[PDB]
A = this chain, B = another copy of it.
Amino acid sequence: ATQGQVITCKAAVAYEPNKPLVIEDVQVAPPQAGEVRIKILYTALCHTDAYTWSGKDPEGLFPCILGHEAAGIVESVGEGVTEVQAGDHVIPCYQAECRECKFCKSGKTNLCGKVRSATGVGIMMNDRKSRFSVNGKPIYHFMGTSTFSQYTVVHDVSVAKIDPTAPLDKVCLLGCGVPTGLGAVWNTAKVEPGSNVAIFGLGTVGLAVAEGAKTAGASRIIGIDIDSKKYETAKKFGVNEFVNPKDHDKPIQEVIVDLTDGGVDYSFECIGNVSVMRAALECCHKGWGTSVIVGVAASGQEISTRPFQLVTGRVWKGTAFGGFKSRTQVPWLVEKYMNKEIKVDEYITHNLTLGEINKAFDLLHEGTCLRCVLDTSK
């Protein structure tokens, strides 16, 4: 019986950047109007969590509870919440879908600005305060989700209600990395059957691009990485050719153009390296090739090219959460998963507990790690 009451539970707190996370007993306040309190059962670590932890984000607010890929069960809801109720199985999402703002109503984008003025600064809309504290001191939320915790509080416009038979230690991946890569292909690029595709970076997101391209009927799916072992792992996701830039004196974009007689029809940058973003554009075919930025670059870094690349017909764009509408389409992706129409399981290479989260951070520097999933019960 926890409705209307503070909950005390375990969470990993980041007190300062580039230092080990601390497991604490934190207090989680009840949900206010338009809010959902969620019992988080499984959560995965994403490089975006490490971006802010590693001090690379000048907007980083500390102390905070990181985490944004997760799945769990609603414990209670606040005033006026009707789309979910206690007991529902849910995926909290960094990308909200309010269906009422200028962006939601435009029909032109999947962005939503309803709760950005709070979630971007680690607080809640209804009272401009945080629902987390430890030893009497408030803690910042992160990305509107804060899932490295046994319980979190999120805005209702960011909660997807999913099939209650779907295994929660698998579908936690569908809150970020996998939909970002799939939708880069299906929504942003709109890749046609028979297309030639290049994928720069063969981590989780690049492998989901490969799956999206394979599902859509692409012909050549060329992976580019400096770690050739990543190619062996990538084969089951659809990568069917590989180039290591270190094997060639010519710049990688020229090697790709030579290999495809002119360049690829689509390219995808999945690392967040601006120098690789330039190479990805320049390897696109003259007259029509399109390059999609998928990885998130570090603050202040700029992409560059000579404008004749665009004047002679290449197109530069990018994707946020693969162009998907979270509350409407994340449940559809869970349906497809349950039908064996999209891969999820194969991305999960490690399973740890929340108490071992610092070991999970260490696995981010392991090439064989794609996604580590953490059980929050221990």
A→B interface (CB under 8 Å): 102-103, 106, 108-109, 111, 262, 274, 277, 286-288, 293, 296-297, 300-320
Contact = CB atoms under 8 A, between A and B. Distances in A.
Given A287-B103, A287-B106, A288-B106, A306 B302 contact: yes
Q: How many copies does the complex hold?
A: 2
A109 B305 CA distance: 21
Contact of A297 (B288, B293, B297, B308): B308
B288 A102 contact: no
A302 B307 CA distance: 6
B318 A313 contact: yes
**Which of A262, A303, A307 gathers the greatest number of chain B CB atoms within 10 Å?**
A307
A189 to B, nearest CB: 12
A288 B103 CA distance: 9
B310 A316 contact: yes
B319 A311 contact: yes
A307 B108 contact: no
Contacts of A308: 296-297, 318
Contacts of A304: 302-304
A287 B111 contact: yes
A248 to B, nearest CB: 23
A307 B109 contact: no
A304 B301 CA distance: 10
Contacts of A319: 311
Contact of A311 (B102, B293, B301): B293
B311 A306 contact: no
B320 A288 contact: no
**Which of A274, A305, A306, A310 gathers the greatest number of chain B CB atoms within 10 Å?**
A310
Nearest to A104: B287
